[PDB]
Ligand binder design. Structure first.
Ligand SMILES: [Cl-]
Ligand SMILES: [Cl-]
Ligand SMILES: [Cl-]
Ligand SMILES: [Cl-]
Ligand SMILES: [Cl-]
Ligand SMILES: [Cl-]
Ligand SMILES: [Cl-]
Ligand SMILES: [Cl-]
Ligand SMILES: [Cl-]
Ligand SMILES: [Cl-]
Ligand SMILES: [Cl-]
Ligand SMILES: [Cl-]
Lengths: 173, 173, 173, 173
């Protein structure tokens, strides 16, 4: 093992590699979400831009994990990326539910890794997660919950019109 | 024939003149679309501006074909311009369908002319179409499809209100 | 199929989806190349930055294919992304050979798709490839060949010192 | 004890004083490293500047610990500073190994103090270490590992020439 590696367990190393995979899979899911909303028969540009920016954020998350892995003297291992769970994502409401579910799985993986670092007495790992991932997920998920609430309120009224209004007046375009 | 004319078939020359006519007819259709939406009893300014800008684009297309015709040593021939297929264009939805149909006819004429240039081994013609017309039509038609989808979604909900919202929140004014 | 789709064969649609997959796989290969060179026991920063920028370029390629797919009225389908062919990439020389091999596979897939568009008389497809992919690959591959030559010349002399000099004096850091 | 002191154990107080001593000793080691490389018969200016900047960083570390000690109502106690372990530091490679060893001892003392704060339920201490010391050491040690790798690769080739190239092309001067 590495000349620099110190207080860095194999359990944490491997879990960091799994987390990289989860983040790249999320990024890929968000790419598929974004381009679904760009279809001519869906055509909600602000929704497309929302999911494409999330694709970027998740890729950046992964990259940040990989940088850390190298900083600790671990070794990055890449595995196959599973395709997104759906080919078509339904309405804005369906999509935003799927996104929240996804984020909550990432958040749980983050919390599991934190618990691992704590069990291994790896405070650098814990600090790294706290500083760059945990707060960001909480803020993201809150934002998604808020969006969901606003979508629900809109489409309960009139589904088509509601979706158009959300995209125009809440989402960036 | 011309001192400069080289690898420029009469078949292509004539088809370029027909394409100029199609483009000027489209321009004229779009003028009629634009001013319909400016009527006091229709009064959707953003729709009027959308179709007037398309009138301009099609005129520019024609002008660009005529410039090319002269560059190749062909001779521009003008024929009568047929009036637009309708005097009244119905709703925003009806209008946007009519526009897509029109664009798809232009696009097909572009593809037919490209196939002609290829059969005649006229790579300058093909390149000219590729560079200035084919990509532009594809982008336009996609934009129109997107608009149509958004109009459909809006007016399925409530026809009058939907149309007003589209014009205010998607179209430039 | 789509309201906008015109002269867009299912053969081309499917091949565009396969090309997206190839590009995202290349992007992922380049991510693994980049982070290998960031390991404490490899530590060639300019090499890492070279491969990370290529990761970005390939992702952008894919995104550009997906945008086009939607513009034509095709439907994006995502499949599993295969992990990179190696976990460790050897020397700068080995890595640059692997990269050239990869680029040449992309280039061949581009040429195959071009031949398909030509057989299907899809000039928009051909133009799209010509404009955004074919020239870029040729330029890239030439650059990689040049790098390879310079690496070979350097490491034939003294392997370690040569590699350090290439990274410092040719690569950006 | 102090009017302000709260949740601040004597065990932590004393360990903070020992850490100040370790940091000032490291600073002094780095002063000796820096000036060795400034000798007329060694004359590697970039190496001298690298170690002098590290001397400064370690002094700043100590100062930051002392500030914190006072903030918590502890009392700073100074002890003798042991001279550096060597009077002459050999090659750039030998020096960089010695530096990594030193940093890893500081890092271990940081981790031990963190474990102490955790055992004492002193979250302010833990946070203080996480925020200002743990990440910084990890980044430093990674940088030193990278340097070591590059030095090794260079001097395996030709010792004198390699050392000169590292100093000129990697180190700041
Ligand atoms: Cl372990
Ligand atoms: Cl799967
Ligand atoms: Cl913590
Ligand atoms: Cl002829
Ligand atoms: Cl008529
Ligand atoms: Cl051509
Ligand atoms: Cl077909
Ligand atoms: Cl595989
Ligand atoms: Cl072509
Ligand atoms: Cl106590
Ligand atoms: Cl001593
Ligand atoms: Cl903490």
């Amino acid at each position: 093992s590495s000349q620099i590696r110190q207080n860095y367990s194999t359990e944490v190393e491997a879990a960091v590699n799994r987390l990289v995979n989860l983040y790249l899979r999320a990024s890929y899911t968000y790419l598929s979400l974004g381009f679904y909303f760009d279809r001519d028969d869906v055509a909600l540009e602000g929704v497309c831009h929302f999911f494409r920016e999330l694709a970027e954020e998740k890729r950046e998350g992964a990259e940040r994990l990989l940088k850390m892995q190298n900083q600790r003297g671990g070794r990055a291992l890449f595995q196959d990326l599973q395709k997104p769970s759906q080919d078509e994502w339904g309405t804005t409401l369906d999509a935003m539910k799927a996104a929240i579910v996804l984020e909550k799985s990432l958040n749980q993986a983050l919390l599991d890794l934190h618990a691992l670092g704590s069990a291994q007495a790896d405070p650098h790992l814990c600090d790294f997660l706290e500083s760059h991932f945990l707060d960001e997920e909480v803020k993201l998920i809150k934002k998604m919950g808020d969006h969901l609430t606003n979508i629900q309120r809109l489409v309960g009224s009139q589904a088509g019109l509601g979706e158009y209004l959300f995209e125009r007046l809440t989402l960036k375009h």
